Design a protein around this ligand. Structure first.
Ligand SMILES: O=c1ccn([C@H]2C[C@H](O)[C@@H](COP(=O)(O)OP(=O)(O)OP(=O)(O)O)O2)c(=O)[nH]1
Ligand SMILES: O=c1ccn([C@H]2C[C@H](O)[C@@H](COP(=O)(O)OP(=O)(O)OP(=O)(O)O)O2)c(=O)[nH]1
Ligand SMILES: O=c1ccn([C@H]2C[C@H](O)[C@@H](COP(=O)(O)OP(=O)(O)OP(=O)(O)O)O2)c(=O)[nH]1
Ligand SMILES: [Mg+2]
Ligand SMILES: [Mg+2]
Ligand SMILES: [Mg+2]
Lengths: 148, 161, 140
């Protein structure tokens, strides 16, 4: 399971839903995410968009980070201001998309990806300590310690 | 001690400070960060908020990236527009939080977390080259090459301006 | 071997200062502009850096992120920055000005963003399931 992922589709197999997460090319590092439903994000608006899928299984030692796509950012003057997917998350992935235009609305459409998902390697910390370091003497005082 | 972290609290053990960085659940990838000071971020404002802690020791091969939390982003219409913590940083972690509301202020309160810190794996590059590639012929020219210093040579340091 | 090595490609013949880490503990390469401009209030700029990535370190891709100073001092953000490992073009920094009144001066001597080589998983096996019914399965 070092390089495998399992996405969970929230809609029943007979029902119409979002296009599945897909990497555009063999060198694409992220899966393009698509909306389940259409909308127009008003100027200066912030939208929480359902993608139709969750992550059932993550690659070993990775989590999912939703980041913006260059096209959506540049062409539509947007950003994706958050996107950290915890490895115990059993829900549907939502894309949070901000419109930075004071005048133009952002069209959200079924066939156009709105953001992309990267499987980043992170450290799942096993031992943590909080210390106070005395700047004059160099003395270290352990405040708290915890083992996961 | 490859999957271990040490946070340094800047306030002496007898003084009131921020709640320590803490992961909310066993599957939470990031440590929730708390403020050591209170304020109200004006509409369209940007704040640099002290957390009360630094990182004394990072997990092997990782650095710290401060990123936004979904709740703070969505409920308070904010973003965390920067957050790269270098592995030689000995200072206090500060959260840079932007308010995107044109009308409402964002309340920053002790005990309410404002961002989260992830220990991401990165490549500490040891060898680098700069090349020029001719688009018509395909010929390559090496412009520069550098190997990251590894305490082989020492020299007296000289003051700047 | 190529586990901790990078090759940058300069587009100008033997226009911008090269990507450079400020200190031994700096995790990212500061990127510099190959052109000057003033980003109008609430503007969004796509700034050329003068360099591409010819070779990435093994198992890494390039992520362009904001620098703290540029963000705080100039009220900016870097709202996108994912560099695919098959990208043969010049790196562009997308920089947003969040000020309603002040412009952001972009000048060749000042770094505008920074590039981190992050470790990621290049997925080899993927499945779509309905919760279990396998909907689709694909091997890269
Ligand atoms: O763009 C995003 C970000 C997060 N999430 C989901 C998955 C993630 O595991 C969960 C919580 O994210 P985070 O830890 O950033 O938010 P929080 O404010 O701590 O959430 P809560 O206290 O509701 O858990 O929300 C999304 O679907 N989309
Ligand atoms: O959200 C953030 C980002 C950075 N930092 C600290 C730790 C980091 O190591 C240092 C420098 O960050 P960066 O390299 O992004 O900033 P810079 O503009 O290059 O800073 P400087 O030249 O002042 O070091 O600032 C924070 O506390 N919070
Ligand atoms: O800040 C950025 C982001 C991206 N890129 C380049 C390199 C990257 O490989 C390419 C595509 O980025 P992304 O996949 O985010 O954008 P897209 O809208 O999906 O474009 P494409 O259709 O090429 O994948 O654009 C930049 O130069 N600067
Ligand atoms: Mg793409
Ligand atoms: Mg959380
Ligand atoms: Mg720096």
């Amino acid at each position: 399971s070092s390089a495998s992922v399992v996405f969970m589709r929230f809609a029943p197999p007979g029902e119409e839903t979002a296009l599945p997460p897909r990497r555009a090319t063999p060198g694409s590092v992220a899966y393009d995410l698509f909306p389940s439903e259409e909308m127009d994000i008003e100027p200066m608006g912030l939208a929480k968009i359902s993608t139709g899928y969750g992550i059932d299984k993550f690659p070993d030692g990775c989590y999912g980070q939703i980041v913006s796509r260059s096209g959506m950012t540049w062409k539509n003057n947007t950003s994706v201001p958050t996107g950290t997917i915890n490895v115990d998350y059993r829900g549907e992935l939502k894309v949070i998309l901000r419109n930075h235009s004071a005048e133009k609305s952002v069209p959200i459409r079924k066939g156009t990806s709105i953001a992309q998902l990267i499987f980043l390697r992170y450290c799942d910390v096993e031992e943590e300590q909080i210390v106070y370091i005395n700047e004059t003497t160099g003395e270290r005082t352990i405040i708290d310690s915890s083992s996961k």
